[PDB]
Amino acid sequence: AVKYLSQEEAQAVDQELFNEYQFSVDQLMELAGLSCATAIAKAYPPTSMSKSPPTVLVICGPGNNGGDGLVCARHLKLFGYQPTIYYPKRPNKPLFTGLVTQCQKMDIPFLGEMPPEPMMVDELYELVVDAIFGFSFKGDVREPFHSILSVLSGLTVPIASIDIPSGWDVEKGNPSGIQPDLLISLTAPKKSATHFTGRYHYLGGRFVPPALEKKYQLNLPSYPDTECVYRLQ
Amino acid sequence: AVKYLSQEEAQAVDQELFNEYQFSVDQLMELAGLSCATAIAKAYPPTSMSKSPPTVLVICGPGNNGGDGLVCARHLKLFGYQPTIYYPKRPNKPLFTGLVTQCQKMDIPFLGEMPPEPMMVDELYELVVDAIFGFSFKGDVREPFHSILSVLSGLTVPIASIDIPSGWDVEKGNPSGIQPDLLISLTAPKKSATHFTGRYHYLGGRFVPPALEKKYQLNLPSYPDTECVYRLQ
Numbered sequence: 001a002v003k004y005l006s007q008e009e010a011q012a013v014d015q016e017l018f019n020e021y022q023f024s025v026d027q028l029m030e031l032a033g034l035s036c037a038t039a040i041a042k043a044y045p046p047t048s049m050s051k052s053p054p055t056v057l058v059i060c061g062p063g064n065n066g067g068d069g070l071v072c073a074r075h076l077k078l079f080g081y082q083p084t085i086y087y088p089k090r091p092n093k094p095l096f097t098g099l100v101t102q103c104q105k106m107d108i109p110f111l112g113e114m115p116p117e118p119m120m121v122d123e124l125y126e127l128v129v130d131a132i133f134g135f136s137f138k139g140d141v142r143e144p145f146h147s148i149l150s151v152l153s154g155l156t157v158p159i160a161s162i163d164i165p166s167g168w169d170v171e172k173g174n175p176s177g178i179q180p181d182l183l184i185s186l187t188a189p190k191k192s193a194t195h196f197t198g199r200y201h202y203l204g205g206r207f208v209p210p211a212l213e214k215k216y217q218l219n220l221p222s223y224p225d226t227e228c229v230y231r232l233q
Numbered sequence: 234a235v236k237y238l239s240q241e242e243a244q245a246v247d248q249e250l251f252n253e254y255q256f257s258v259d260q261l262m263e264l265a266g267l268s269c270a271t272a273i274a275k276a277y278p279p280t281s282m283s284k285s286p287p288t289v290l291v292i293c294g295p296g297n298n299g300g301d302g303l304v305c306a307r308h309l310k311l312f313g314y315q316p317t318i319y320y321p322k323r324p325n326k327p328l329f330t331g332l333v334t335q336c337q338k339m340d341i342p343f344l345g346e347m348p349p350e351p352m353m354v355d356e357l358y359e360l361v362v363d364a365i366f367g368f369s370f371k372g373d374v375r376e377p378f379h380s381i382l383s384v385l386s387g388l389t390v391p392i393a394s395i396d397i398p399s400g401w402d403v404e405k406g407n408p409s410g411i412q413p414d415l416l417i418s419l420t421a422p423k424k425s426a427t428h429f430t431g432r433y434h435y436l437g438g439r440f441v442p443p444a445l446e447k448k449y450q451l452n453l454p455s456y457p458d459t460e461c462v463y464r465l466q
């Protein structure tokens with residue numbers, strides 16, 4: 001079976017990829033976001049949905065996980081979804097300012113505020129993508145993320161979480177946290193993923209060098225043909 | 234039918250993508266290289282080949298097209314090919330030095346010299362990827378590329394060309410140039426592509442914003458589901 005990483009292991013793998021393998025953040029953020037959009041189109045293919053094109057709200061956090069969300073949105077649009085983004089805390093770095101411009105010019109709207117009620121989210125968006133916090137989370141959910149998670153936990157439409165469900169302890173999960181319907185584990189699952197009880201758990205980030213996988217015994221499954229996601233079951 | 238771009242149009246589209254849409258070179262080079270590796274795995278799936286894993290020589294030029302080649306190689310390895318790279322002229326920029334390290338650490342070998350004879354290439358490599366020059370070419374094929382193209386034109390194994398077959402006039406082609414078996418047109422075909430007479434012509438670079446496609450009337454076809462390549466016929 002695939003390995004489920006401790007937060008320490010995940011941090012080491014991430015730092016190896018950027019330092020020893022000298023991947024750039026742009027590159028792996030592009031592949032991660034693409035895997036997300038791909039996992040989502042396979043779990044919730046546009047023809048299975050009742051709006052045409054189907055609607056999706058992507059909520060982006062203040063760091064890299066939110067970055068992945070921005071990329072996911074752009075790919076989702078190319079895949080025939082109609083995404084909307086909420087991105088309340090944006091770093092002023094070229095990486096993030098670039099991604100914003102790209103999405104803007106793809107006519108993906110950035111909401112001024114979060115719809116305050118779960119019912120209103122449900123009415124407007126057929127799916128919600130949680131791109132708030134990822135494997136590095138140790139918080140301390142500060143505003144506005146506490147208030148956002150509290151809306152999310154009342155939703156009826158499915159949530160897709162990027163890497164980790166935001167607000168979960170990365171290893172121990174969170175019995176009173178959000179309960180997503182899809183979890184896209186990037187590179188390999190974290191220990192919290194044993195607490196997942198949604199329908200769809202995909203592995204994404206098809207970029208792990210074999211030597212890295214072997215050194216960490218990830219026991220990653222074989223991705224089919226040229227697919228960048230694998231459905232774990 | 235899809236539009237076939239003049240060199241001027243292609244230059245304008247490229248500059249729009251990097252300036253007005255503010256995509257970064259890393260990002261689109263990653264998607265372009267991924268489309269290449271994907272086109273190649275669909276045209277020459279590993280089970281159709283007689284070596285296991287099948288062998289591929291990727292020849293990288295001195296610019297961005299060679300960049301795409303480097304990325305293509307890395308993805309090809311993940312897709313179950315055994316690539317080898319020849320990369321004689323390497324810019325000393327972090328983009329290219331990064332990509333080299335990545336390939337090195339994936340245990341993809343960089344050849345010290347080109348096999349001097351077509352027969353020796355044919356014996357060692359089941360496929361050859363031409364990543365030498367792309368849409369920006371106006372040369373003036375300087376050494377060592379002249380000598381490389383002269384080996385390539387004597388090969389029996391197929392050549393896959395990235396964007397344009399290296400040594401062709403970007404609009405007018407080249408009756409005495411190389412004759413690849415696969416052409417991966419990136420973003421949209423160039424006018425030289427009307428002179429293509431290999432078996433496989435794929436379109437790649439699934440990243441053209443709809444507004445850009447409309448402004449240039451690319452008439453791009455519909456990519457299927459989440460695929461990043463489309464077979465033109």
Ligand SMILES: Cc1cn([C@H]2C[C@H](OP(=O)(O)O)[C@@H](CO)O2)c(=O)[nH]c1=O
Nearest residue numbers: 010013014028029032064135163186187
């Ligand atoms: C090891 C690991 C990496 N990643 C992401 C971080 C990087 O993308 P980004 O930084 O854009 O989220 C990439 C490689 O480390 O994959 C995870 O999301 N979770 C993990 O457990």
Ligand SMILES: Cc1cn([C@H]2C[C@H](OP(=O)(O)O)[C@@H](CO)O2)c(=O)[nH]c1=O
Nearest residue numbers: 243246247261262265297368396419420
């Ligand atoms: C418009 C156009 C872009 N491209 C490439 C260049 C960029 O990738 P790269 O620079 O890594 O080759 C990307 C967007 O312009 O697609 C072509 O290869 N041919 C074209 O005709």
